[PDB]
Amino acid sequence: KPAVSVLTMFRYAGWLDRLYMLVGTLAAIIHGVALPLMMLIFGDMTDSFASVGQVSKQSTQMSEADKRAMFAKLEEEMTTYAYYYTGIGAGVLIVAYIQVSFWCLAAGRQIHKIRQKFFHAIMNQEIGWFDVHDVGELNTRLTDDVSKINEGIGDKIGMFFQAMATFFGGFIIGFTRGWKLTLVILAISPVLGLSAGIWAKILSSFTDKELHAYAKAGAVAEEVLAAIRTVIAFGGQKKELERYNNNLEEAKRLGIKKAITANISMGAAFLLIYASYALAFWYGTSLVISKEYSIGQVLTVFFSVLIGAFSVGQASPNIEAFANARGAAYEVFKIIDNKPSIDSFSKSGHKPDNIQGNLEFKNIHFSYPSRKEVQILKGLNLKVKSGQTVALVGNSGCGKSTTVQLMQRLYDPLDGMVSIDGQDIRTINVRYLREIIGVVSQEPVLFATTIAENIRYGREDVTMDEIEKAVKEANAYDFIMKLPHQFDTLVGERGAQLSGGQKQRIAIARALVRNPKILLLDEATSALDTESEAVVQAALDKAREGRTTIVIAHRLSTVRNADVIAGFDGGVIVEQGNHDELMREKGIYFKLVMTQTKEALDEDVPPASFWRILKLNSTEWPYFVVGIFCAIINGGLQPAFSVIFSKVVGVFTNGGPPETQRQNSNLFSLLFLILGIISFITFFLQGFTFGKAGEILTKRLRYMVFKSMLRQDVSWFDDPKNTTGALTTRLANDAAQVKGATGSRLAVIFQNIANLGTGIIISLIYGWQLTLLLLAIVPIIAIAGVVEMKMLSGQALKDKKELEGSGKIATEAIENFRTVVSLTREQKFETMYAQSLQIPYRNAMKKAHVFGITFSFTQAMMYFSYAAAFRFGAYLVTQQLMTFENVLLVFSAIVFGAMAVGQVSSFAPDYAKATVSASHIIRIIEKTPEIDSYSTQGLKPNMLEGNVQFSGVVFNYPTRPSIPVLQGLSLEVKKGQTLALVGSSGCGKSTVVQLLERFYDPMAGSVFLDGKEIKQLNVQWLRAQLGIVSQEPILFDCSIAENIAYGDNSRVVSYEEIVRAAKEANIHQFIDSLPDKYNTRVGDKGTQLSGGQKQRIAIARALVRQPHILLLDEATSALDTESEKVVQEALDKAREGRTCIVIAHRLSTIQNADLIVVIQNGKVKEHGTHQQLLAQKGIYFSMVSVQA
Ligand SMILES: [Hg+2]
Ligand SMILES: [Hg+2]
Ligand SMILES: [Hg+2]
Ligand SMILES: [Hg+2]
Ligand SMILES: [Hg+2]
Ligand SMILES: [Hg+2]
Ligand SMILES: [Hg+2]
């Protein structure tokens, strides 16, 4: 992975940026050291209480003279401690605000310069850069990668310096307060980073191993879901379900292990930190007994050292964000610093005023930059006199267009020169070069605006009268004036779709507005109907007037009118001259003449569910039984520590027998280790209870999901929201994440209720008023913890929804780059981009202020909490209310328990995302289709007859109930006779075939098979004897024998049936000859096949089941030569003795049909045979006269 140097990345930082960064980091430094100072003042606080305990504990000395030396002493000490706590907090809000504000600010100001300079950099690039680069990743890189460079030069590094200031501040306060104890804890430290390091490598080994493990099942997932139509047709839903399942109990089982190791890792971490507590307290409290360190110092160095150590843990991801940001900026700064060969953005050449118009190509040797191994132009020599129209022909290769592309100087020639008049094309300015050169490309392109605005892109300073005039010159004035909103009518991609000739003529107007002295026409009339070609060419012929024109047309009808015809054979121009010469010489030209004669849309719709999801995992009780008790133990483990922590510092503050200090000390420290051991047990156990659970729940669930997915109707697969990728994504992620909302949530809710629950009872017995204070303060801060991520992600989505405006501009300008560069007008797009960007950048200031005051509001309060609880608590202890040990207990129970529920909440996956991903699963499963392929009801007769009849039957597609397809057409087909379906296009030529295959239910009317209604028949059995052949046949990546035998399921096909169906489809000759026989894989993973052969396989497939009805729907549209003969030759022998329905556009093979039905609109207007419908002189007579 690449990476820019650090110094290089902040290049766009100015005076104010460097100022903001230095001041921000300086605030982050002093903010970072606030917390350790808070621990120092906490130790100096506890030392004051430990003095008041031991005197009032043993016997009785002075009752009236205690209140002056104890009660009055602690008040005087706390009145200062409160000023220290509150002072520090008051500083915290200030420096935090400076920190986040200034950083988010300066970073934003740099990002604003970066995205702009990046966009200009892209526009500045030449077309050769676009040849080697995918535009798709380029367009997304402007949004994703710049937003990614934004993160990591913002608040992230302010928090990095804060975390490091906390590290250094913690170790400095540690060593400053204690020499030995800090060394002891730090001696325990290396065993943690080594443990965290090894366990992070273990699960990440299984994580990357899981991805290519399910990819095997996801392979058959998309293969089926893509081919589903052919699946439901052949009903292999049983076999495809089994095939999908076979790869499931292979992948997830491997995931079980990872789950377990992840829990073991977490348990190891807790064991080790608990061991650190036990050890540090064992040494510290043994150290206070020899009267070296005080009680407060042990707490001070322990807390400052721990905090300083965990500070690294909180500095790791922030520095990570900065790391990939430099990796992201390499690609972007590469494009910016890239200066193109053709600029094209400034003027450095000449701008001739003659401007004359003579074209010359002298010795042009050129090859494309993408493929340099192949040379296109080899010594091209071509001259065009003034105002002369030259046509290029020869059907050589890309070279024709290359000349056009060379002429507007998109590419510079490898050898030789293109000269307009006496000067080279390179000696003249590019912008001015393309202003004097007009171009009309093969595919017309209009931007999404008014017609007028599409014209303005041709030239900006155009008055409305000039626009109209230019439209009238383009014969486009007629239809524009018929448009509803006239010249203000929208066009382009979205809204108001126009026909190709109209779109092209608007473009011609656009080019005519620039008034170029040279006009280039590259396949202008191509890909157009003969009716629009007339008008477009009518405009073009009038656009060639007084201009030097070089024209390329595939259709040679419009070529002859040119002044000079130049032929292309290979890379060199051979024959050049007038029409009569090129006919008389019988060259290439003469040969050509004789031969041519959805993400957001998903999660929004589902309602529900609350705790219904647990029923999905309810298949396994025992795991949950052990899991709840387990989670209760690990949960009640936390209040235990609040007691034992208070008991250690309690033995040194509350006084008591010194001979019992050691005895108790070693008890409680050791106790902590026990407390660690048990915590290791829980995480080992939970991993075997909920850990397996959610995985089993996954496998079974995917199975279930997939089954229901095949149960679904075809109309459900037509729903735009359910795509093969969306279904495979639903199946891959949402199904597996459901476990986040089942057992994990019970674990979280039980560890939480055990912790804060039992802890609150304990703190309620040992404290009354203080407990009531903390259960007030804590929830208030918790809500602040919620609002923090509410206003953070809330204004984050708002910032993106206001950036989609620019994203549209840059997207449209990049996707059509090859078009805009021909019209210049790049700088115009830059202008529109900056104008679009000015709005979100004006909100960046307010953004920073809001983020600042919010971060400071969450953080400031935190210190003030301490300041409240300890002031009020000291007020409690100073009086008859006891004691201090219980103050510290209540505090540690409620507060550390509150943080503990936060950690537990951060363990489990996102419950919201889990429930929403769950709802899609429960809905996909409980989804009952109209037509059910799984039903075991139905008639199942003996009668092999097979008479097809459509009576009434009016249908319209459920996806788009606009313009019904069948308006009640009726027909009939008896056994052995073949039906023929004729019409202008599809709907409902193919809808008949789909309806007989029962993919849909018509709204009114009925379709009968024999004497029975179809709806009465068994669903699967109906399709059991229906042969279906589509326009593009598909095979499964299994094998050939399986493909052929895929025709008939629920039966052993064996060698005999496959060879028997092979020999009649005439495919047996292609099998033995190609190594090897039947074992070969089709396709794309095996040996490729031509359309004809694969189609013959598709025939053999539908022929195995011995169907009494064949449905042939536009069978071979792409088949050519003699390949089409043998296919239909194999169809004709298998059509005898069967009911057949043929849809073809050929109309040549329909003449032999028994019945020919012409279907127009929604009904049947013509019925009869070929000669019968021919002698009728109806619409069939109009359609069959185009055969000549
Ligand atoms: Hg920011
Ligand atoms: Hg080309
Ligand atoms: Hg547990
Ligand atoms: Hg379609
Ligand atoms: Hg259709
Ligand atoms: Hg297969
Ligand atoms: Hg047929």
b/e burial code for range 1026-1059 (CB count within 10 A of at least 16 → b) = bbbbbeebbbbeebbbbbbbbbbbeeebeeebbe
- Pair (551, 641) in one structural domain: no
Two tokens, residue 982: 């004729």
174 in a known ligand binding site: no
Identify which ligand lies nearest to the alpha carbon of 987.
5
Q: How far is the CA of 216 from the centre of ligand 6 (A)?
A: 13
- Pair (930, 870) in one structural domain: yes
> Taking a C-beta distance cutoff of 8 angstroms, is the pair 1023, 998 a contact?
yes
d(CA 1115, CA 1133): 16
Domain endpoint, select from 545, 566, 598: 598
Identify which ligand lies nearest to the alpha carbon of 691.
3
Two tokens, residue 858: 């969450």
With residue 924 as reference, give the H or E element that holds it: helix 911-925
Residue 339 burial by Cβ neighbours in a 10 Å radius (0-12, 13-18, 19+): exposed
d(CA 1007, CA 948): 8
Would you give the distance in Å from CA 384 to the centre of its chain? 51
Two tokens, residue 223: 């293969």
Neighbours of ion ligand 2 (CB under 5 A): 398, 401
Q: How far is the CA of 377 from the centre of ligand 7 (A)?
A: 51
Residue 982: strand pairing partners: 1158
Q: How far is the CA of 661 from the centre of ligand 1 (A)?
A: 53
Identify which ligand lies nearest to the alpha carbon of 979.
7
Amino acid identity for residue 42 in this structure: F
- Length of the chain as a residue count: 1188
HEC letters along 726-745: HHHHHHHHHCCHHHHHCHHH
d(CA 895, CA 777): 10
Q: How far is CA 534 from CA 502, 525, 526, 529, 531, in A?
A: 12, 9, 12, 9, 6
d(CA 407, CA 72): 97
Bridge-based pairing state of the strands 423-424 and 1026-1029: unpaired
Question: How large is the C-alpha radius of gyration of the chain?
Answer: 40
d(CA 196, CA 189): 11
Amino acid identity for residue 1082 in this structure: V
Q: How far is the CA of 1095 from the centre of ligand 7 (A)?
A: 16
Q: How far is the CA of 284 from the centre of ligand 5 (A)?
A: 81
d(CA 1035, CA 230): 9
Q: Please report how many Cα atoms fall inside a 13 Å half-sphere around the Cα of residue 540, on the Cβ side.
A: 30
- Pair (917, 790) in one structural domain: yes
**What's the DSSP call for residue 1026?**
E
Q: How far is the CA of 1095 from the centre of ligand 4 (A)?
A: 20
CATH code where residue 962 lies: 3.40.50.300
Residues contacting 625, CB < 8 A, separation 6+: none
- Pair (815, 805) in one structural domain: yes
48 in a known ligand binding site: no
Residues contacting 615, CB < 8 A, separation 6+: none
Identify which ligand lies nearest to the alpha carbon of 263.
3
d(CA 900, CA 919): 30
- Pair (993, 905) in one structural domain: no
Query: Strands, E, within 61-179: which ranges?
Result: none
Bridge-based pairing state of the strands 423-424 and 415-420: antiparallel
Residue 415: strand pairing partners: 365
1049 in a known ligand binding site: no
Q: How far is the CA of 994 from the centre of ligand 4 (A)?
A: 13
Two tokens, residue 457: 């892109």
**What's the DSSP call for residue 1033?**
-
| Helix residue ranges, H only, 607-719 | 614-617, 621-653, 659-711, 714-717
d(CA 918, CA 615): 12
Q: How far is the CA of 226 from the centre of ligand 2 (A)?
A: 33
Would you give the distance in Å from CA 979 to the centre of its chain? 47
- CB atoms closer than 10 angstroms to residue 910: 12
Diameter over CA atoms, the chain: 136
* Dihedral, CA of residue 765, residue 768, residue 774 and residue 779, to nearest 10: 80
Q: How far is the CA of 714 from the centre of ligand 4 (A)?
A: 13
**Of 724, 883, 758, 908, which is closest to residue 70 (Cα–Cα)?**
883
Residues contacting 1073, CB < 8 A, separation 6+: none
- Pair (581, 603) in one structural domain: no
Identify which ligand lies nearest to the alpha carbon of 960.
5
d(CA 664, CA 641): 15
- Pair (780, 759) in one structural domain: yes
- Pair (927, 941) in one structural domain: no
d(CA 374, CA 10): 43
Identify which ligand lies nearest to the alpha carbon of 1128.
7
What do you get for the CA distance between the two ends of the chain, in Å? 63
**After which residues is the backbone of the chain broken at C–N > 2.5 Å?**
597
Identify which ligand lies nearest to the alpha carbon of 681.
3
With residue 771 as reference, give the H or E element that holds it: helix 769-801
Q: Which domain holds residue 1130?
A: 937-1188
User: Hey, is 1027 helix, strand or coil?
Assistant: strand
Neighbours of ion ligand 6 (CB under 5 A): 1036, 1038
**What's the DSSP call for residue 910?**
P
> Taking a C-beta distance cutoff of 8 angstroms, is the pair 775, 894 a contact?
yes
Two tokens, residue 227: 């081919």
Q: How far is the CA of 985 from the centre of ligand 5 (A)?
A: 10
d(CA 1017, CA 1127): 33
Domain endpoint, select from 936, 968, 990: 936
Q: How far is CA 880 from CA 71, 81, 169, 429, 1053, in A?
A: 10, 22, 38, 94, 94
- Pair (298, 375) in one structural domain: no
> Taking a C-beta distance cutoff of 8 angstroms, is the pair 1127, 1116 a contact?
yes
**Of 557, 549, 556, 578, which is closest to residue 566 (Cα–Cα)?**
578
Two tokens, residue 586: 């019988």
> Taking a C-beta distance cutoff of 8 angstroms, is the pair 243, 220 a contact?
yes
| Helix residue ranges, H only, 1048-1166 | 1054-1064, 1068-1073, 1091-1104, 1123-1134
986 in a known ligand binding site: yes
Would you give the distance in Å from CA 106 to the centre of its chain? 30
Amino acid identity for residue 1064 in this structure: E
Residues contacting 1047, CB < 8 A, separation 6+: 234, 1061, 1100, 1101, 1102, 1103, 1104, 1105
Bridge-based pairing state of the strands 1155-1160 and 1163-1168: antiparallel
Quote the number of domains for the chain.
3
> Taking a C-beta distance cutoff of 8 angstroms, is the pair 407, 353 a contact?
no
Q: How far is the CA of 154 from the centre of ligand 1 (A)?
A: 5
> Taking a C-beta distance cutoff of 8 angstroms, is the pair 264, 683 a contact?
yes
Domain endpoint, select from 920, 936, 952: 936
d(CA 753, CA 783): 18
With residue 551 as reference, give the H or E element that holds it: strand 548-552
Identify which ligand lies nearest to the alpha carbon of 977.
7
**Of 1113, 1111, 1060, 1118, which is closest to residue 1093 (Cα–Cα)?**
1118
d(CA 534, CA 342): 38
Q: How far is the CA of 333 from the centre of ligand 1 (A)?
A: 21
* Dihedral, CA of residue 268, residue 269, residue 273 and residue 279, to nearest 10: 30
d(CA 35, CA 307): 8
| Helix residue ranges, H only, 879-942 | 885-907, 911-925
- Pair (415, 508) in one structural domain: yes
399 in a known ligand binding site: yes
d(CA 136, CA 141): 9
d(CA 891, CA 871): 12
400 in a known ligand binding site: yes
Angle at 204 between CA 198 and CA 208, to 5 degrees: 150
Q: List the resolution, Å.
A: 3.8
Query: At how many degrees (to 10) do helices 190-234 and 248-289 cross?
Result: 160
Edge-first strand order for the sheet with 548-552 is: 437-440, 518-522, 548-552, 389-393, 564-569, 572-577
- Pair (254, 384) in one structural domain: no
- CB atoms closer than 10 angstroms to residue 430: 22
Q: How far is the CA of 80 from the centre of ligand 1 (A)?
A: 38
Residue 365: strand pairing partners: 415
d(CA 958, CA 903): 49
**Of 161, 99, 151, which is closest to residue 314 (Cα–Cα)?**
161
* Owner of token pair 């053999």: 1100
User: Hey, is 368 helix, strand or coil?
Assistant: coil
Residues contacting 195, CB < 8 A, separation 6+: 268, 269, 272
* Owner of token pair 């700088």: 827
Q: How far is the CA of 349 from the centre of ligand 1 (A)?
A: 44
> Taking a C-beta distance cutoff of 8 angstroms, is the pair 188, 280 a contact?
yes
d(CA 710, CA 547): 63
With residue 405 as reference, give the H or E element that holds it: helix 399-407
Residue 566: strand pairing partners: 392, 576
CATH code where residue 766 lies: 1.20.1560.10
646 in a known ligand binding site: no
Q: How far is the CA of 974 from the centre of ligand 7 (A)?
A: 13
Query: What phi-psi label fits residue 976: left (phi over 0), alpha (psi between -120 and 50 degrees) or beta?
Result: left
Q: How far is the CA of 237 from the centre of ligand 4 (A)?
A: 23
Q: How far is the CA of 939 from the centre of ligand 7 (A)?
A: 27
- Pair (930, 977) in one structural domain: no
Q: How far is the CA of 774 from the centre of ligand 4 (A)?
A: 65
